Each structure stands twice: as structure tokens, then as C-alpha cells.
Amino acid sequence: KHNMKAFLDELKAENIKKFLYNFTQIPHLAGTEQNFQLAKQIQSQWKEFGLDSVELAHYDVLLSYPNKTHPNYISIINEDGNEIFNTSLFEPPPPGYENVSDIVPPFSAFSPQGMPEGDLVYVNYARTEDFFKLERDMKINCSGKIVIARYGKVFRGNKVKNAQLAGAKGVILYSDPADYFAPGVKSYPDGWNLPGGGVQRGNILNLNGAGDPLTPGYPANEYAYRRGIAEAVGLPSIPVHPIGYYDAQKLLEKMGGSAPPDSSWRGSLKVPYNVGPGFTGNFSTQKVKMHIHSTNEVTRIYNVIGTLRGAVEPDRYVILGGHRDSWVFGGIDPQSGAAVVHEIVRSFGTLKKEGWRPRRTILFASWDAEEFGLLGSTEWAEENSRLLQERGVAYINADSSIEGNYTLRVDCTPLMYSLVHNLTKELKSPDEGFEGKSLYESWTKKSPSPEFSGMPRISKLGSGNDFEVFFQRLGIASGRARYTKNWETNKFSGYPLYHSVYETYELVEKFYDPMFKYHLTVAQVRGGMVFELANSIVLPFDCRDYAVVLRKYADKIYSISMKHPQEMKTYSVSFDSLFSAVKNFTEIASKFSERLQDFSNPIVLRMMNDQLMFLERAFIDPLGLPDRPFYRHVIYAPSSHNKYAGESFPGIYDALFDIESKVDPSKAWGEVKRQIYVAAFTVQAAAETLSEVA
Amino acid sequence: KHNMKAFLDELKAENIKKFLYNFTQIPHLAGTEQNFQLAKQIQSQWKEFGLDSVELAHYDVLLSYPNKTHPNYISIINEDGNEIFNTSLFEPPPPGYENVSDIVPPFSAFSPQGMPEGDLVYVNYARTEDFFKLERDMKINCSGKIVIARYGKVFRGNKVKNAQLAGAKGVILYSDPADYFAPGVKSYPDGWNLPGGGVQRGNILNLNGAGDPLTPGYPANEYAYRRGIAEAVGLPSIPVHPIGYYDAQKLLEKMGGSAPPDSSWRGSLKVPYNVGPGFTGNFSTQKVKMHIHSTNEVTRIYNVIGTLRGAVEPDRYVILGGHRDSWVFGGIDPQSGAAVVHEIVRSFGTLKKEGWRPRRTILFASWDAEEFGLLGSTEWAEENSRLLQERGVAYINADSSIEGNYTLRVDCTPLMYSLVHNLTKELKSPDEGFEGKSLYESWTKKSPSPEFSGMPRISKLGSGNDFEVFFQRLGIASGRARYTKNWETNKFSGYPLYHSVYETYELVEKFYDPMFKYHLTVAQVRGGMVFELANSIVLPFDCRDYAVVLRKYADKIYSISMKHPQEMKTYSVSFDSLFSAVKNFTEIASKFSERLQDFSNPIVLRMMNDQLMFLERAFIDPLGLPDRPFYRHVIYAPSSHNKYAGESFPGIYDALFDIESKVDPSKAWGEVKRQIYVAAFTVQAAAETLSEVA
Ligand SMILES: *[C@@H]1O[C@H](CO)[C@@H](O[C@@H]2O[C@H](CO)[C@@H](O[C@@H]3O[C@H](CO)[C@@H](O)[C@H](O[C@H]4O[C@H](CO)[C@@H](O)[C@H](O)[C@@H]4O)[C@@H]3O)[C@H](O)[C@H]2NC(C)=O)[C@H](O)[C@H]1NC(C)=O
Ligand SMILES: *[C@@H]1O[C@H](CO)[C@@H](O[C@@H]2O[C@H](CO)[C@@H](O[C@@H]3O[C@H](CO)[C@@H](O)[C@H](O[C@H]4O[C@H](CO)[C@@H](O)[C@H](O)[C@@H]4O)[C@@H]3O)[C@H](O)[C@H]2NC(C)=O)[C@H](O)[C@H]1NC(C)=O
Ligand SMILES: O=C(N[C@@H](CCCCNC(=O)c1ccc(I)cc1)C(=O)O)N[C@H](C(=O)O)c1ccc(O)cc1
Ligand SMILES: O=C(N[C@@H](CCCCNC(=O)c1ccc(I)cc1)C(=O)O)N[C@H](C(=O)O)c1ccc(O)cc1
Ligand SMILES: *[C@@H]1O[C@H](CO)[C@@H](O[C@@H]2O[C@H](CO)[C@@H](O)[C@H](O)[C@H]2NC(C)=O)[C@H](O)[C@H]1NC(C)=O
Ligand SMILES: *[C@@H]1O[C@H](CO)[C@@H](O[C@@H]2O[C@H](CO)[C@@H](O)[C@H](O)[C@H]2NC(C)=O)[C@H](O)[C@H]1NC(C)=O
Ligand SMILES: *[C@@H]1O[C@H](CO)[C@@H](O[C@@H]2O[C@H](CO)[C@@H](O)[C@H](O)[C@H]2NC(C)=O)[C@H](O)[C@H]1NC(C)=O
Ligand SMILES: *[C@@H]1O[C@H](CO)[C@@H](O[C@@H]2O[C@H](CO)[C@@H](O)[C@H](O)[C@H]2NC(C)=O)[C@H](O)[C@H]1NC(C)=O
Ligand SMILES: *[C@@H]1O[C@H](CO)[C@@H](O[C@@H]2O[C@H](CO)[C@@H](O)[C@H](O)[C@H]2NC(C)=O)[C@H](O)[C@H]1NC(C)=O
Ligand SMILES: *[C@@H]1O[C@H](CO)[C@@H](O[C@@H]2O[C@H](CO)[C@@H](O)[C@H](O)[C@H]2NC(C)=O)[C@H](O)[C@H]1NC(C)=O
Ligand SMILES: *[C@@H]1O[C@H](CO)[C@@H](O)[C@H](O)[C@H]1NC(C)=O
Ligand SMILES: *[C@@H]1O[C@H](CO)[C@@H](O)[C@H](O)[C@H]1NC(C)=O
Ligand SMILES: *[C@@H]1O[C@H](CO)[C@@H](O)[C@H](O)[C@H]1NC(C)=O
Ligand SMILES: *[C@@H]1O[C@H](CO)[C@@H](O)[C@H](O)[C@H]1NC(C)=O
Ligand SMILES: *[C@@H]1O[C@H](CO)[C@@H](O)[C@H](O)[C@H]1NC(C)=O
Ligand SMILES: *[C@@H]1O[C@H](CO)[C@@H](O)[C@H](O)[C@H]1NC(C)=O
Ligand SMILES: [Ca+2]
Ligand SMILES: [Ca+2]
Ligand SMILES: [Cl-]
Ligand SMILES: [Cl-]
Ligand SMILES: [Zn+2]
Ligand SMILES: [Zn+2]
Ligand SMILES: [Zn+2]
Ligand SMILES: [Zn+2]
Description:
2 copies of one chain form a homodimer. Helices cover 36% and strands 16% of the residues of chain A. Chain A is of the alpha/beta class. The first copy, chain A, has 3 domains: 314 residues, Aminopeptidase (3-Layer(aba) Sandwich); 226 residues, Glucose Oxidase, domain 1, CATH 3.50.30; 154 residues, Transcription Elongation Factor S-II, Chain A, CATH 1.20.930. In chain A, the strands form 5 sheets. A 7-stranded mixed sheet of chain A has the order 1-12-14-13-15-17-16, sandwiched between helices. Chains A and B meet through β13, α10, α19 and α21 of A and β13, α10, α19 and α21 of B. A molecule of 4 linked components (NAG-NAG-BMA-MAN) binds next to α18 and α21 of chain B. It is classed as hydrolase/hydrolase inhibitor. Keywords: hydrolase, metallopeptidase, hydrolase-hydrolase inhibitor complex. The assembly is dimeric. X-ray structure of of human glutamate carboxypeptidase II (GCPII) in a complex with CHIBzL, a urea-based inhibitor N~2~-{[(S)-carboxy(4-hydroxyphenyl)methyl]carbamoyl}-N~6~-(4-iodobenzoyl)-L-lysine. Chains A, B are Glutamate carboxypeptidase 2.
């Protein structure tokens, strides 16, 4: 029989291991020849595996690269202008790769060029609240200073945005062992910790969903009209560069001015973590100088797009996508995900060769230039937006399959919650101590829901990966799942060797997943979800789960507002319409669920499947969120303070945020009321898509 | 049998006549009690007629009304400030209605209040080219002047916008007998011409598709947040008031300054048509003073929405809509259309009582507040946008059924051309001399296509009626048809008694359509289109017709650009991508047509019907046109100089318009290239929706 069990049994750990090895021998940086050759390899193999069509879709987008003959570095310079200390020009390469060429040195992609020299101020994680503490409580002025911030807690692009608005003239990012060195584990190559010479690469854009900075709204195809650089979307205006903790220690050890305001500002290095500005008395005349010579350049990128045509509903698309480009070898990010995708394609292709086809069309994607701003997935979605919005059922992402070996991590739309719970009850746990138990059981035990006993935690989607255009722009139900660690305060910081030259095949095979059993479990979750979405007669979405969360998010936003009871009285700020809409949604969803259970008629079925598919789409506002026109989902957007975190009712959240500091309270509360009206209207309109159609 | 012939035969001229009489005895001004009582009457009757559900949808929108105890008028005042001449406070009422109350006096809806006094300048029709002639060729400065303009040629709101940008401090609009008095016909009540005391009412907004000025984007429901008046959309900033030609003669006869520049500036009154500024020597010290005291006020409006549920595809909607509100009695505009709609509902209801239902759902609408800015249809579409965009097949408008008695007039999307040609070949001509001939034959004879021999003229949709939100915002295939005159230069000016107190039942019954045969023919066209759209197994749209017009519009926009060959060389302005996209669309459409003719499989049918329904939707750009975010269709928008006229490739058209006058030619041609890229991309993306789906 050709059922889900046949699909799942065909998946093999040893194939995933072979593919991961094959994908991680040389760097695959976006826009380079090596990554184009990998794209051609994948296209060839997906054809062999049995897909109906496999094409490359290419775009010409703005990328950023260091200058190979003019390296980036930071100095401490004395009053004579002698550079008395320099940061490293490259990470020491790992064993057996000291002769690989084309390893890009650490840099912050899209940094402008410059050689700013100044006094340092230390800004902790450079979060919005860190800058509030500095400026409002400690009265420290960052204007004209170089800021130094530790990586962690929030997306680095938010750090740079915050530093810019504070008037910084440059930013130095570094990895503190407090956040990137787990106690009791050895540094790479002897364990999975970050060495003092290791450095985290990564872009520092603030694109807000735009895609290629030069072509917002439209695909960067051959005849595209491009904005000039000065009008490009999301580029930083000050130079930025990342360093490891050996180098950071040299920059921080001389720091003077104010003590850190409290212990949450101190990392694990043997330095005082003084905030500055500038160095202590003896070194008061030394300055820090950046030298950044990176260049932005329009460069061709390639997505691989494979199609397995549906037998019954070929005009309904279930998409499984993950990126192929890596900063260096990509042992975890992204090739641990790409190897899982490759084995899923292989498995579906095996069934196809035996005569089976899915009910709906499945599209498989190997995206390019994810690391430079989700460019490949966003350009392709801009090109195909009309097909996706009328035909897109679901998007399942597949970046890193593992970032630890403790338990499952899932973020998805509430419409997928029931699907995830049901699938994981049918899968075997790979965990020690849970042999013969379900993955649901182990996951629920290790990661309990904060609301409901006997259920696991599933989080909101944020951004920082390729599902963003599909979910936040186009309103296609999306999900993602991987294996993770037990390290809650580090849930947005990355694993220790994230985006470093040390993230290699050997890292994974020695320290994370020697038997490839966690990879295999993630392949069964991602693959199983795709199978059910593409094959279930009725789409496996439960609208009642959206009704439950909408009440939770309404209670939450109401509670934030109620911190300001006098203003709510003065400006007549009522959440009544929003609660009314949520109540109506709950009632209508309950009635729709009853009909869905209660109907041989394929028109009524498809009518009902269209109601299910277009429910996520109903939360899209075509006017977008304030000053973020490509974030259109009214219930969820990436947090304005941390692109990685999802925020619920973001329009109302941002209208309320720091409202006690706004100079015109009448205008600020007016905008809160406006966002409540938009949210109540959208929830009611989404509910009405589930009413009887006539 | 229940087929189209049964539907058509049930329609009766004498029922249309009864309904028109019933709808035109008292004024039905939007927001008044009388119009609410008519809405309740219609709701009751549509229920009786047999619709499944008939509800009122209400909104609270900004309307405008004169002050009943402080009337609007214009004076000529002498140097002492004595008002030596006053315009009329009301139109003399027609015979037998001198005792009807609540006839709104002539006013320009949404005019601000003010009492500006100044010298007059005469600006012909106040078109963009009229103001170019004044300012650029004649060197006359309108700044601080009161402008007087004759109605005609373009929408009055464009006149007021043009006068504002020229620096006018007020506008006087009047009806010249050249445009509103056909030679050889008598004035009302003895013929259908405009008397010298007659005055054309009408709004002077520049909404660009926004709907209610206070709630752009969202329905004006009970909890809506409203913009303050100073941020409202589209309100004029200078006072405006309309007058008849007896009063205009008094204002124009004393005019001095420059002679009219040529004969196209002279109307038919016995005055010189001097342009001014100001009066001749003897009267040089007299001024003109406006007194405008109208008020804008948020007021409830009511749409009637009737549903006839589809038997097979109830989640596909064919909508027949027309407005109910009138300036005064609405004998032609809109009740000649509303009476046709009422008889169509009656006919469909007769079939329904015999057990028939259409394949698809038909929605029938009686819109309110059309005259104040398409408010009722736009608010309702904003409320229901998610249902309409995923389920809307087509919208057929039904305002005035007659504006003359000569031949058919049709404006529609190219997707409906084949449908209109085929239907009119099956209908009888009502025209004298064509008894026993088809309507197609008479229409083709009287209104030949300017391109093809043996075909009739069908025009582009513009705006100025309730189809605008459905077509230009949401991208639902739309059409309209009425009987018209033979008076080509007056095709945007209105019939002589347009928006006057004289547009009565007696006007229609005595002078336009005594046998109601032209009404009946229009009911067969509108009703027939609705029947075919709601009942045909395959939707009756031909994508190849869009391919033909896209080539025509591409040739046209290329020819405009080619007036500037040196700039096209300097800035490398190429239309190659646009022609490439049009060629691809032609090829793909031809292949799709072949498949559509070549497939018992209801999935493939509906897949194909969805391709047809979503083709118009593919021309929508979610980012809208430049500074007109609610005009989203890339192929068609209302002309920026004349809201009534459609413009093709409007983004490129407006980028090219008057380009030789822009100060930064590099920037201006850059924007032309940007609009060519958006248009080529959109055409190619629309084409791709017709490719095989997987
Ligand atoms: C959740 O669903 C419910 C339906 O179950 C829906 O209820 C609707 O609420 C609206 C807004 O409150 C009601 O609007 C009223 O409609 C009547 C006519 O039906 C009007 O006469 C009312 O206006 C008068 O009263 C107002 C309030 O004091 C005054 O401001 C006004 O000037 C008038 O005097 C009012 O517009 C509507 O009837 C119901 N519909 C029903 C019960 O079917 C509710 O709105 C949904 N929630 C959301 C957020 O959409
Ligand atoms: C109309 O449909 C046709 C398909 O029938 C479609 O043709 C496509 O045109 C594009 C754009 O011209 C082609 O793009 C080329 O793709 C190849 C690889 O396939 C690239 O190597 C090419 O790039 C090189 O050449 C360029 C031009 O000189 C250089 O600028 C560039 O730097 C490279 O050296 C180029 O990108 C594409 O192959 C075809 N696709 C086909 C034939 O299937 C056409 O674009 C459609 N029209 C519109 C407006 O969409
Ligand atoms: O590296 C990225 N993403 C990794 C690391 C993300 C670190 C924080 N982790 C999470 O947000 C997270 C949440 C839920 C799950 I299930 C898994 C990870 C990832 O998604 O695996 N994306 C890069 C980056 O962060 O530099 C990125 C970020 C922004 C952008 O526009 C384009 C690319
Ligand atoms: O009166 C209106 N429409 C009438 C008169 C339009 C006069 C010009 N005629 C046409 O544009 C036309 C084109 C094709 C056909 I078939 C029929 C008429 C109508 O459409 O019958 N609409 C009113 C107005 O013009 O004051 C209007 C205008 C703008 C607006 O936002 C809201 C209402
Ligand atoms: C990764 O695996 C691929 C596919 O097996 C290898 O590419 C093949 O290499 C052989 C021997 O050079 C050629 O004959 C084939 O044409 C290739 N097939 C393709 C590209 O589809 C590739 O060598 C492996 N890469 C590494 C680093 O081991
Ligand atoms: C840090 O690097 C800088 C730049 O290479 C070094 O300064 C240069 O030293 C060479 C030879 O000694 C001079 O000819 C250059 O003119 C210097 N350039 C600049 C920009 O100062 C510096 O010596 C290095 N410092 C340390 C401690 O290694
Ligand atoms: C997850 O599994 C549950 C339990 O099987 C499914 O809920 C059942 O669905 C069937 C079919 O409609 C009903 O007859 C039962 O009454 C349901 N049991 C319940 C609600 O406890 C549920 O549909 C599955 N979720 C999916 C497929 O998304
Ligand atoms: C227009 O026609 C309607 C419907 O026939 C008339 O309204 C009816 O009036 C009678 C007598 O007053 C009442 O008994 C009914 O209740 C009404 N029916 C409705 C409103 O559905 C109305 O009188 C006519 N109007 C004019 C001006 O002739
Ligand atoms: C035009 O109307 C104005 C306003 O009603 C007339 O002027 C008024 O005349 C009365 C009585 O004669 C005075 O008490 C008012 O003070 C005047 N008002 C203003 C604003 O001037 C004027 O007489 C009328 N002119 C003509 C020719 O009829
Ligand atoms: C209008 O009528 C023409 C002539 O009947 C229709 O075109 C024919 O359609 C049938 C069914 O597909 C074909 O088999 C013929 O070959 C067509 N004749 C032609 C193209 O000359 C056309 O489909 C009708 N248009 C509609 C319904 O929109
Ligand atoms: C990189 O630096 C070299 C060496 O100084 C210089 O000649 C070249 O212009 C730079 N490359 C760029 C800016 O792409
Ligand atoms: C910070 O310093 C800059 C540069 O001198 C100054 O212009 C600015 O006003 C200062 N801001 C505060 C809040 O002290
Ligand atoms: C794998 O799991 C073991 C057992 O708990 C743990 O000690 C080890 O560090 C894990 N590896 C990683 C990378 O977390
Ligand atoms: C209309 O004019 C009257 C009479 O002068 C005045 O009292 C009232 O304020 C006005 N009504 C308005 C502005 O609605
Ligand atoms: C028109 O007159 C105004 C008012 O005095 C003046 O400011 C403006 O510059 C003039 N414009 C032209 C084009 O002469
Ligand atoms: C009706 O048609 C006749 C015959 O051509 C014409 O003389 C008459 O004026 C028409 N009525 C109108 C309003 O056009
Ligand atoms: Ca783009
Ligand atoms: Ca509105
Ligand atoms: Cl992922
Ligand atoms: Cl019409
Ligand atoms: Zn990644
Ligand atoms: Zn990454
Ligand atoms: Zn009308
Ligand atoms: Zn009108």
C-alpha cells in the first residue's frame, strides 16, 4: 500500500548522513561558483529521484562581500595613530581544512565602508531595553561613540538599528562565552563549544520582509528596474564588524566610565564590563578604530524548484523549502536541513516510481541567498505571488534539522497544531529513556505547554527564515520543526558554533547526532506534515485552534493596555470590538467544524477545503502594518525589537509600546484605537469566510 | 424548460414602467428618511419575489448637505459691498411638483464653507489642457481668482482639482447651452432640453477609489476609527457652487481682459467668453462673491443585498448592482436602472419559485450614497473584500438604463467581449428600421468598432460608478450597458437634464422611452449577461480577447513615448520587456483556449474556471498605482485628468504625461522605466496563471 507509513519507512538515517557529508565538503556562499554547482547537482539528483520537473529560477540581487585584497579589522590606536592591537583577519581553520580556499572571513554582510575612530561604549545585548537603561537611567550618551555589544537574545540587525538610532558611529559585535560557551564542554574540535578565535558571521539588514534591497515588490529578473543604493531598503548607515572573545577581551579589558548597572550586564570574561565611554585613566587617550572595506554588488542567485504533480488537485500546492547557501561549510545551518529535504524528495520519488502520486501538487525548493536576507525565497514568491495566493495550501520550512539533541521544537500557525499533535503521536521517540514511546510523549515530557497539562509547547512563527514571505506577506499556513537543546534563555542566540567556520560535518557526526536518528526523526516530522497536507482528503487544519489563541492574544494585549487605566478612561480606549470579534470567530469556527464533520460531494468538499486554505489568507491586510508594508498578517508579525520573535496583534502592540514616553498622548492613544479597529475588523472578516457561503 | 429564453421572456416593459413610476414620486437623497423607506420597500419586495435572503447592510459615512436656513448663492457686489445681482436659491420645480418638499437645492457636495470675493477668470471646461493654455500660452495667472468653468468633457471633481492647483480661491460651475441644449428641441417640460434655471448637482471629491473619506481601507461600521476632517481623503479646499445658464450669462456678460484664444473656448451664450481676469472698464470695480454654508456630516446609509443561492457552485458569486439614491427624483439616474434591476430580480424569482436555481450564486444589490462618492458599494466591498476576492466571478452594474434612444453603449473588461457579442446576436433590436433584426446588427451599424469592420464599439471601463471598487480595486471582471444617444463630443457630459430637478418619470415616459422598449432591451442585456455568468458550465470569458487589447495598448503607450526619441536614447528606455510579455500572454492564452475546448472531469473544469475567474485578479498590484493605492489594476485605471474615462497602462501613461516639462529628466525617465517593468512583469505574471498548473 501507498500510505504515510510507506513514505516514512523509506526514509533512512544513513542516506541523510551521506547527503550531509556530500553537502559540506566545501563552502557554498551565495553568489559563488561553488553554490551554483551544488544547485546543478541538486537539480540533477531531484530529476533522478523522480520529480516531474526540476528547474533553476535565477535572480540578480544585492549581495555583500569583503574585499579580498583590503581586509576588514578593528584596532586600538594610540594618540600618535599607531595601531597597537589588531583583531584577527580570519578564524583559525578547523583540522584538515587548513587548505580549503574561499572561506569567507568573518564580516557583517551589508555593512557600509568606513574607518570611524572613537571611544567605546558597552551596550550589553544592544536591545531596546539596554539602550533605555543607558540613556534614560544612566544618562550615557552614545552619540559619536563606537558601540560594542554582545551577540545573543535578539537578531543582530535589531542591535545595529538600535545603535544607529542612538547616534553610534560604528558597532562591534562579539560572542561572549556566557552565551556561546556551555559549562563543562570543550571547544571545537574536541567538543561543540566556540573557541576564542571563532566568530559568528551574519547579515545586519532591516528589510522588514522586502527581499532584495533594490527591487521591493517585484522579482529581480532580467529587466527589473533597480533602486539606486541611496534608496535601497534596509541597509545600515554605520560600519559593523563581528569578533571572537579573545579579541573582545582586549577591547573590553581597558574600559572605564560607569560600572555595569547590574549583573545581567556582565558576561563571563575576566573584565569589569564597564559601560564607558572610553578607557580608564592611563589609556584615556587611546581610541578604537574600525576598518571596513566590504562592497555591495548585484550578483546572480539560483533557486532549485522541483514539482511532483498532484493526481486530483494539481492546482493546490504544498511547498517544502529550505535554503542551500551557507556562510562557510553549513554543517548544521543549512545542510542538516537540506540533507533531510533531499531524503524526503528521494522517498516521495520512490513512491512515484511505483505509480503513486499525491492528491495535491508538492513543490520542493532549495533556496539561495537566505543568509543575505531571505532573498531567493522572497524573489521567487514575488515572481509567483498570484499562483501562491490562489493555490498555496501550506509551506513547511526545512533549515537546520538539529541545534541540539534534547527534544523537538515546533513553531507553526494554530491551523497546524492538531496535525502536529496527531503526527507526533504516531512517530517513535528517538530519545534515550523513551524507547518504545511516541515522540509526542517525549516532547510533551521535556517541553510542556505553559497553558495546558499533557500538551507540548508550540511557539508563534517569527522571522529570520524563508517561511517569512509565505506566511507574513502572502498568508499561507506555514510551519517548521527541528531538534533543539535544553537552554531556554538562549532560544534566540544560536548554538555555540552558529555561523562559524567550525560548523562542519564532523561537528554533527561526532557531537550532535552520530547515528543520524534525530535527523531521521525531523525528516519524519517535516515529511509527514507534507504528506498529510498533500494527501488528506479534507485539509488537516483545525480552525477552532485559531479561535483559542485569538482569545489568548486578545487577553494579552488588553492586559498591556490596562497598565494605563487613566489614559484608557480619558481617550475612551475600548477592546470590546476585539473581544466581540474573537467571540464571533469562536462561534462560527465551531459551526464550521460541525459542517466539516457532517458532509460524497466533491464541490462541497473543495468549497470546504477552499474555506480552510483561505482562512490564513483572511488575516492579511493589503495595506500592511504601519511603515512595514510587506508584513501584512494582522495577527502575527516579527517583533519590531527582535526579528526572530513573533509578536501577536503587532499593530496594537507597537502602538502601545513605550506609549508613556510619547509627547502627544492624544495622538498616540488615537493610533492604539485605530489598531484595535483594524484587528477587530480583520478577525470578524476572517470569521465570516467560515460562514455558509450563501 | 428553465433556460435563458425563459428568463428573458418573463421580463416585461410594463413592469419596468410601473417600478420606475413607483421609484420617482419623491426625492431619495442619500442619508434621508425617504431613501431609507425605499430601501425597506425593496428589501420587502425582493423577499416576495423569491430571493433566499435579503438584508440591509448599513454604514456611517461622511455626507454633505446645504444649510436649510442659510442658503448658498453667488453675488456680484459693487465697491460699496452692495450685492447687485444674486444667483437663484432653487430650480423652478417642474409642473405638478411645485409642492413636493425636501428637494435639495443645487449645490456641490463636499464644498468647504467660505465667502471668497474676487475677480473672475473663465477657464473653459477647466481641463488640464485648458489650464495649460491659460498659464503657459496666455500667461494668465489664476492665483487668488474665482474661476468660472463650464460643465462637460470631464468629471467636475477634476475641474476643481485643476482649479485648486492653479491657485483659484473658488470655482463656479455652470451648464452652457452649447453642451446641454440640443438644437431644435424644446426645454423641459415641453422637450428634454435644460431650461436656463436648471442646474446640475454633483459631488466634487477626488477620492481615487477610497470610499468614505474618513475610513479608507476599512468599512465604516459601528466601531470604526475615523480620520479627523483635516486628514479626510479627497475633500476640496476651496468653495464650489453650480449655476444655470441664465445666471451664468449675468456673470459672464461683463467679462474683460483677454479674448478667448479660439472658438473651442466659446459656448452658445450671447457673451464674448473673455477670459478675464475681471470685468471690462466700467465694471472694473465690481467683484464676484460666493456664499457657501454647506456642512459635512457623518450619516447612516443602507445597502439592500439579496442572495439567490447557487445549486452547484454556491461559493461563486455573480453580482448585479446599481444605486438607489438620487439627487432629486432620479427619473433616469438611477431609477431607470433600479427599475430594470427590480424586474430582473422578479424574473429570476419566478424561475426560482418553479424549482430552478442558477449554477452559481447571484447577489443583487441596491447601493446607497453612490452620488456622494460610490460610498455604499465601496464600504460594502471593503467589509466583504476577502469573500469577493476569492469568490467573485463578475460584477454587472445597473445605473441609468437610458441616456438616449439611438443605440447600445457598452463598457466592459475584454474577458466579456465574446459574451456581449454572442448575447446581442440572440436579442431582438428595438430600433425603428431594424424590426426582425438582431440587437447586434443594429448596434454594429450605428456604433461601429474603430478597429474592426462588422463589429460594434465596446469601450474601456473608467469610473464614476459603483463597479469601481470591484474592478479597479479588487480585480473582478466587470461590465455595464445602456441605451445612448448619437452625440460623440458629449459622451462624458451627461444628457441635458442630468442631476437636475427635471429628471422625472414624465421626462422618461414622454420623451425617452414611452413604450419602455429600450428599458426592456437593456434589461435583456444586463439580465442575460448575469444569467450566462451564473449558469454557463464553463465561465463565458475569452482570455484571447485580453491578448488582442494588450497589444493595442502596448502599441499606444510605445507611440506616446516615441514622441521623445532623444530621451529614449539617452536614458535607454526600452519597451521590449512589455512587448515580450504581451507576446507570451498571446501564446499562453491561445494554448489555454485549446485546453478549455479539449477536456466529464469537474476538478479540471473548476480548475479551469478558477483560472478564468482569477485572470482579471492577476492584473491587480497589491502596492497600487503611484499615490493612488486603491487603484490597483495595472492595465486600467480612471484617467488622472478625467475620472470618467478609462486609461490603459495608467502607470506608464502618467509617468509620460507632460514629461517634457519635468525639471529632472533623468528622474522622470527613470520612473517611466520603472512603470514599464511593473507593467511587463504584471502581464507576464497574469499570463502564467493560464499555464498548466503543474
Ligand atoms: C459579532 O456578531 C454579532 C452578530 O451576532 C454582531 O452584532 C451586530 O452588532 C452591530 C454593531 O453593534 C449591530 O448594529 C446595530 O444594528 C442596528 C440595526 O440592526 C442599528 O439600529 C444599531 O444602531 C443603533 O444603535 C447604536 C448603538 O447604540 C447607535 O450608535 C446608532 O446610532 C443606532 O441608534 C446598530 O448599528 C448589529 O445589529 C448586529 N447584528 C446582528 C445582531 O445580527 C457584531 O457586530 C459582531 N462583532 C464584530 C466585531 O463584528
Ligand atoms: C517570455 O517568455 C520567454 C520564454 O519563452 C521568456 O524567456 C526567458 O527570457 C529570459 C530573460 O531574457 C532568459 O534569461 C536568460 O536565462 C539564461 C539561462 O536560462 C541566462 O544565462 C541569461 O543570462 C545571460 O544573458 C543575459 C542577457 O545578455 C545577461 O544579462 C546575463 O548576465 C547572462 O550572461 C538570461 O538570464 C530565459 O532563459 C528565458 N526563458 C526561457 C527561454 O525559457 C521571457 O522572459 C518572457 N518575457 C517576459 C517579459 O517575462
Ligand atoms: O540564521 C538564520 N536563522 C537560523 C538561526 C536563528 C537563531 C534564532 N533561532 C530561532 O529564531 C528559531 C525559532 C524556532 C525554531 I522550530 C528554530 C529556530 C535559523 O532560523 O535556524 N537566519 C539569518 C540570520 O539570523 O543571520 C537571517 C536573518 C534575517 C534575514 O532577513 C535573513 C537571514
Ligand atoms: O453621475 C455619475 N455617473 C453617471 C453619469 C456619468 C456621465 C459620464 N458618462 C459616462 O462616463 C458613461 C460611460 C459609459 C457608459 I455604458 C455610461 C456612461 C453614470 O455613470 O451614468 N456618477 C457620479 C457623478 O458623476 O456625479 C459620481 C462620480 C464620482 C464619484 O466618486 C461618485 C459619483
Ligand atoms: C556529491 O555527490 C554527487 C552525486 O553523487 C557527486 O557528483 C557526481 O560526481 C561524479 C564523479 O565525479 C560524476 O560522475 C557525476 O556526474 C556527479 N553527479 C552529479 C553532479 O549529479 C559529487 O562528486 C559529490 N561531492 C562530493 C564533495 O563528494
Ligand atoms: C596592525 O595592522 C596595521 C596595518 O597593517 C599595522 O600598521 C602598519 O605597519 C606597517 C609596517 O610596520 C606600516 O608600513 C603601515 O604604514 C602601518 N599601517 C597603518 C595603517 O598603521 C600595525 O603594525 C599592526 N599592529 C600590530 C600590533 O600588529
Ligand atoms: C487528530 O486526531 C483526532 C482524533 O482522531 C481527530 O479528531 C477526530 O476526527 C474524526 C473525524 O472527523 C471525528 O469523527 C472524531 O470525533 C474526532 N475526535 C476528536 C475531536 O476527539 C482530528 O481530526 C485529527 N486532526 C487533524 C486530522 O487535523
Ligand atoms: C410603491 O409600491 C409599493 C409596493 O407596492 C407601495 O408600498 C405599499 O403600500 C401599500 C399601501 O400603502 C401598503 O399596504 C404596503 O405595505 C406597501 N408595501 C411595501 C412597502 O412593501 C408604495 O405605496 C408605492 N409608492 C408609491 C409612491 O406609489
Ligand atoms: C441679494 O441678497 C442679499 C442677501 O439677502 C441682499 O442683501 C441684503 O438685503 C437686506 C434687505 O434689503 C439687508 O438687510 C441685508 O443686510 C443685505 N445683506 C447683505 C449680505 O448684503 C441683496 O439685496 C440681494 N440683491 C438683490 C439684487 O436682490
Ligand atoms: C460565442 O459563440 C461562439 C460561436 O458559437 C463560440 O465559439 C465556439 O465555441 C464552441 C465551443 O467551444 C467551439 O466548438 C467553436 O469552435 C467556437 N466557434 C468559434 C470560435 O468560431 C464562443 O465560445 C462563444 N463565446 C462565449 C460563450 O464567451
Ligand atoms: C579592493 O581593494 C583593492 C586593493 O586596495 C582595490 O584596488 C579595489 O578597488 C577594491 N575592490 C573593490 C572596491 O571591489
Ligand atoms: C548627545 O551628544 C550629542 C553630540 O554632542 C548632542 O548633540 C546630543 O544632544 C546629546 N544628547 C543627549 C540626550 O544628551
Ligand atoms: C547530546 O546529548 C548528550 C546527553 O544528554 C549531551 O551530554 C551532549 O552534550 C549532547 N550534544 C549536544 C551538542 O547537545
Ligand atoms: C445653519 O445656519 C443656521 C442659521 O444661521 C445656524 O444657526 C446653524 O448653525 C447652521 N447649521 C449648521 C452649521 O449645521
Ligand atoms: C501668480 O500670482 C501669485 C500671487 O501674487 C504669485 O505669488 C505667483 O508667483 C504668480 N505666478 C505666476 C506663474 O506668475
Ligand atoms: C427618441 O428618438 C427620436 C427619433 O430619432 C428623436 O427625435 C428623439 O429626440 C429621441 N429622444 C431622445 C431623448 O433622444
Ligand atoms: Ca524583489
Ligand atoms: Ca471605508
Ligand atoms: Cl527550520
Ligand atoms: Cl451603468
Ligand atoms: Zn539557515
Ligand atoms: Zn543562518
Ligand atoms: Zn447614478
Ligand atoms: Zn448620478
